[PDB]
Design a protein around this motif. Structure first.
Motif, short mmCIF file in Angstrom:
data_model
loop_
_atom_site.label_atom_id
_atom_site.label_comp_id
_atom_site.label_asym_id
_atom_site.label_seq_id
_atom_site.Cartn_x
_atom_site.Cartn_y
_atom_site.Cartn_z
N UNK A 31 0.92 -1.27 -0.12
CA UNK A 31 0.07 0.04 0.07
C UNK A 31 0.75 1.20 -0.05
N UNK A 32 2.27 1.29 0.29
CA UNK A 32 2.97 2.51 0.40
C UNK A 32 3.92 2.60 -1.14
N UNK A 33 3.74 1.87 -2.04
CA UNK A 33 4.15 1.74 -3.25
C UNK A 33 5.83 1.47 -3.36
N UNK A 34 6.27 1.01 -2.24
CA UNK A 34 7.80 0.86 -2.20
C UNK A 34 8.22 -0.53 -2.79
N UNK A 35 7.25 -1.68 -2.48
CA UNK A 35 7.66 -2.93 -3.00
C UNK A 35 7.51 -2.78 -4.41
N UNK A 36 6.45 -2.07 -5.00
CA UNK A 36 6.33 -2.08 -6.36
C UNK A 36 7.65 -1.60 -7.05
N UNK A 37 8.33 -0.53 -6.54
CA UNK A 37 9.31 0.15 -7.03
C UNK A 37 10.58 -0.60 -7.00
N UNK A 38 10.65 -1.51 -5.74
CA UNK A 38 12.00 -2.36 -5.49
C UNK A 38 11.74 -3.63 -6.59
N UNK A 39 10.70 -3.97 -7.02
CA UNK A 39 10.63 -4.81 -7.97
C UNK A 39 11.07 -4.52 -9.30
N UNK A 40 10.82 -3.01 -9.65
CA UNK A 40 11.33 -2.65 -10.77
C UNK A 40 12.77 -2.37 -10.90
N UNK A 41 13.10 -1.80 -9.76
CA UNK A 41 14.73 -1.40 -9.68
C UNK A 41 15.15 -2.77 -9.86
N UNK A 42 14.84 -3.70 -9.25
CA UNK A 42 15.59 -5.00 -9.38
C UNK A 42 15.83 -5.50 -10.78
N UNK A 43 14.95 -5.20 -11.61
CA UNK A 43 15.09 -5.57 -13.05
C UNK A 43 15.53 -4.40 -13.94
N UNK A 44 15.45 -3.22 -13.39
CA UNK A 44 15.75 -2.14 -14.21
C UNK A 44 16.08 -0.98 -13.35
N UNK A 45 17.33 -1.13 -12.53
CA UNK A 45 17.75 -0.08 -11.66
C UNK A 45 17.87 1.14 -12.26
N UNK A 46 17.87 1.35 -13.75
CA UNK A 46 18.01 2.45 -14.67
C UNK A 46 16.85 3.27 -14.40
N UNK A 47 15.57 2.68 -14.04
CA UNK A 47 14.47 3.54 -13.94
C UNK A 47 14.10 4.15 -12.63
N UNK A 48 14.74 3.52 -11.60
CA UNK A 48 14.25 4.12 -10.27
C UNK A 48 15.54 4.51 -9.41
N UNK A 49 15.43 5.43 -8.75
CA UNK A 49 16.53 5.87 -7.69
C UNK A 49 15.83 5.69 -6.35
N UNK A 50 15.83 4.32 -6.08
CA UNK A 50 15.15 3.70 -5.25
C UNK A 50 15.27 4.33 -3.75
N UNK A 51 16.83 4.94 -3.69
CA UNK A 51 17.14 5.46 -2.27
C UNK A 51 16.26 6.74 -2.06
N UNK A 52 15.77 7.22 -2.94
CA UNK A 52 15.03 8.66 -2.87
C UNK A 52 13.57 8.49 -2.17
N UNK A 53 13.01 7.23 -2.51
CA UNK A 53 11.83 7.00 -2.15
C UNK A 53 11.58 6.69 -0.55
N UNK A 54 10.60 7.27 0.13
CA UNK A 54 9.97 7.20 1.21
C UNK A 54 8.79 6.49 1.62
N UNK A 55 8.94 5.72 2.53
CA UNK A 55 7.56 4.99 2.54
C UNK A 55 6.30 5.79 2.77
N UNK A 56 6.56 7.14 3.40
CA UNK A 56 5.58 7.87 3.65
C UNK A 56 4.63 8.71 2.29
N UNK A 57 5.44 8.75 1.33
CA UNK A 57 4.77 9.14 -0.13
C UNK A 57 3.99 8.09 -1.02
N UNK A 58 2.95 7.45 -0.19
CA UNK A 58 2.40 6.37 -0.98
C UNK A 58 1.96 6.60 -2.40
#
Length: 108
Positions: A31-58
């Motif tokens: 529900x906070x969108x992190x898992x979805x982004x982690x899945x993507x990053x895992x396959x395409x780290x090029x598309x997300x700067x995961x480190x910038x994401x905070x659980x608060x900004x669902x």
């Protein structure tokens, strides 16, 4: 329970080590969108700067993953951020969408 369970482990395994990601089900774990982004990053780290994401900004997190998946992976935006960011999001919905990711990254 097997397909769901393997799907859950798959997600858990793909996102091993991601901070602030904790997949224990197909509802509140997403529900906070992190898992979805982690899945993507895992396959395409090029598309997300995961480190910038905070659980608060669902909303942001969910829109982010959804928009990128649609835009760069042709994965239809089956879910709506606002619908997902509630307390108890719909499991079936999430699983259906999560499956589209599983196929995509699994095939190809």
């Amino acid at each position: 329970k097997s397909a769901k369970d393997a799907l859950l482990l798959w997600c858990q395994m793909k996102t091993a080590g991601y901070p602030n990601v904790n997949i224990h089900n197909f509802t509140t774990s997403w529900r906070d969108g992190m898992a979805f982004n982690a899945l993507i990053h895992k396959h395409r780290p090029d598309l997300i700067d995961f480190d910038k994401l905070k659980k608060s900004n669902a909303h942001y997190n969910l829109q982010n993953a959804f928009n990128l998946a649609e835009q760069h992976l042709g994965l239809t935006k089956l879910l709506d951020p606002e619908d997902i960011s509630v307390d108890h999001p719909d499991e079936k919905s999430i699983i259906t969408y999560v499956v589209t990711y599983y196929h995509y990254f699994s095939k190809m």
